[model samples]
Structures are given as C-alpha cells and as structure tokens.
Target: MISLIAALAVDRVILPADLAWFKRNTLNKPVIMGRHTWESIGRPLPGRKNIILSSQPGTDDRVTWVKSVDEAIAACGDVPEIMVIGGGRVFEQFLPKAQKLYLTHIDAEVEGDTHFPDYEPDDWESVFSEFHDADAQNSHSYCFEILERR
Candidate 1:
C-alpha cells in the first residue's frame, strides 16, 4: 500500500523549507485539506489534485470538493494513498490513521490559534531528523523530522 505522505510545521508557522518540501512531495499526488486551509492558501494549487473538505463545498473546475474525509478518501479512487493536509480538525480526524508524518518542529514556542495534536512519542519511530538554526526571516530554530507509526 502507498502510505499517505504529509508534512510542514514549525510552532504552527509554515516555513519556506517546509513549503518547498510540501510542494516537492505533493507535485503529482492528490492533496486533501479543510475548507479554511484551502482559504488560507487562496486558490487551487497547480500541478496537483486539490481536494477540499467543506460542509458546503462549491464547484470548482480546478478542485474537487467533498463533504467529509471519507468522501475525500473515496474520491481518490485507486491512488496508492490520499494525502491528508490540514487545518486543525482535518488533521485531528486523520492523525489516528496517518501512517507517517514529515515534521518541522521549531525550538521556540509561539502564540497560535491552531495546533497539531499531541501523541505519545512511543507510538512513533523517528526515521529522520535534521536541525536547522533560525535565519533572518525565520525567527525560530527548527528540526525537520520524519516519523513513522510503529
């Protein structure tokens, strides 16, 4: 089975490296995110299938809108796995079933409205990680890490 791939996080702030990682990884894959997350990005990302989870999804030629995660999963058909991108609740819903995570954990904690869920470290095995010091634009030190469910 193709594992669902997802990532990008740094004290709730998306970084340039993380964004690049997400774009690089999702280029030919179907990406699913919540309504607000879609709004945040502002438009359908080019080159990949954009699937939005909304209570009242509207029709868009460039995107596929669905009422829920299950519908999104079904809409993906025979793809190896559907990518679960998110905005809080969307992540909360799929975190349990997510097989892997590409994480960028920031050293500094900042104020934020949305959050990634907390889980026992024991439940995941860290496959990769690399620390990065903050740059002029990025205000925090961070580590890019990949964790797989054990």
Candidate 2:
C-alpha cells in the first residue's frame, strides 16, 4: 500500500508539524520525497528509510538518492507501505498511487511557493480525525485527519 502524508495551511501551502508526530507515525516506514524536500529537511530523518528523488549525484550513507520516479519506487523494494512525503512535484507524481492520506489541516493561511495538489474529496472517506488548538509550541490550530480511498 502507498500513503501520502502532509500538513497544509488553509490556502494549501505545505507545512510541517513537530518531530513527535513524524516519530509516532513514520518512524519505521520507507519515506520517498523530492530533492527540495530533502534539502529543506537537511539531514536524514532517523529511524526511517529516506529515499530522495534527485537528478544530481550525491553520496550519503543515511539516505538513498534516486534520479527518477521509477528508480525511487524501485529503491523502496517490497515494503508493505510506502510513504510519499513531499514538495509539490513529488506529491503530484505519487498522488494517484496513494491509497491512504494522512493530512494535517492548519487553520491559518500564509504565503508560500509550494502547495499540496488538490484531490477529489468524493473519492476519499475520512477514517479518523483529531483537532488541536494552538498552543505555545504550535502557532496555528489544526486537525489531523486520515482518509482512505473509497
């Protein structure tokens, strides 16, 4: 199975939640992402396999880098569930392949160059949802929702 995980603002700008959320959900999963997302993250996210799609060559023991979508998917081997984390393009490419979606919807909107692609709401059924109010650590109220393709 393939899943896409993301946090986004009201305007659909890509956002990131705290490390705790990632650790709880994606710790041992094989995560595939794009070059810009990898660069934004700066280092390998510990406890998970990081597969980055990039055209440029580079060497790193902590992460596997592939030059194309097929190469990236091949690098995932036979994992039961592949996690597609992203910058816009990466998400777009993998959206159709995802059977589940883990989405965090932030209440605030801010200017951003990157945005999550829109999907057909009628195609998905919400399986779970949790709301969080803005706290000291987080500036915006948000809801975490899990959707399964219907």
Candidate 3:
C-alpha cells in the first residue's frame, strides 16, 4: 500500500509540527520522499528506511537515493506499506497511486511557493479525524485526518 503523509496550513504551506502522532506512527516504516523534503529535514529520520528521489548522487548509511519514482518504489523492496512523504512535485507523482493519506490540516493561512496537490473529495473517505487546539507549541488549530481512497 502507498500512503501519503503531510502537514499543511490552510494556504497549503508545509509547516513544522511538534506533535508526536506522526513520528510515533511512522516509526520503522519505509518512507519515500523528494530530495527537497529530505534536505529540509537535514538528516536521515532515525528508525525508518529513507528513500529519496533525486538526480543528485549521494547516500549515507541511513538513506538511499534514487533517480526516479519507479526506482524509489523498487528500493522499498516489496514492503507491505510505503509512506510517501513529500514536497510538492513528489506528492503530485505519487498521489494518484496512493491508497491512504495521513494529513494534518492547520487553520492558519500562510503564503508559500510550494503547496500540496489538490484532489477530489469524492474520491476519498475520512476514516479517522481529530481536532487539536493551538497551544504554545503550535500557533494554529489543526485537524489530524486519515483518509482512505473510496
């Protein structure tokens, strides 16, 4: 299964989250992402297998770099589920094949050059959802939702 995970504000700007849900849930899974997303995080995420899609040549002990989506998928080596974590372009490439989505929808409207791709609401069903109020760690109220393709 291909699952996409992302956290974005109302304007679709990717934002940082101090929340533990994502980290706890994604642990030990194989995750695929674009080069930009990997760079944004700076290092390999501990525990999970990091497969990055990039033309650049590089790989450390914890990360594997692939040139294309097909190569990235192949690197996962038939894992039961692969997580597509992203920047914009990577999300666009994998969204059509994604069977599930783990999304954090923040209430703030922020401006950004990068945005999540749009998808039809009719094509997905929300299987799980919870609202989180803003606190000292987060500036805006957010909703965590799990969507499965219908």
Q: For each candidate, what TM-score against the reference?
A: 0.84, 0.90, 0.90
lDDT tens readout by residue for model 1, 1-150? 223344435445334656776677677778888888887888888887888888894756678999976788788788865677777778777778778776767666555677776655898899998888888866777687778899
Task: Give the alpha carbon lDDT tens digit for every residue of 1-150 in model 3.
Answer: 888888877767772462586786678899888888887888988899999898889765568989988888889887788888898899999999999988899898877888888977899999999987888777788888999999
- For each of the candidates, give the backbone clash count: 0, 0, 0
> What does candidate 1 score on TM?
0.84
Rank candidates by lDDT, best first: 3, 2, 1
Whole-model alpha-carbon lDDT for candidate 2: 0.84
lDDT of 3: 0.85
Per-residue CA lDDT of candidate 2, range 1-150, in tens? 888888888778882454466567787889998888888788988878999988888566679989988888888888888888887889998888789988888898788988998989999999999898888778888888899999
lDDT of each: 0.73, 0.84, 0.85
Which of 1 and 3 is ahead in lDDT? 3
What value does the lDDT take at residue 127 in candidate 2? Answer: 100
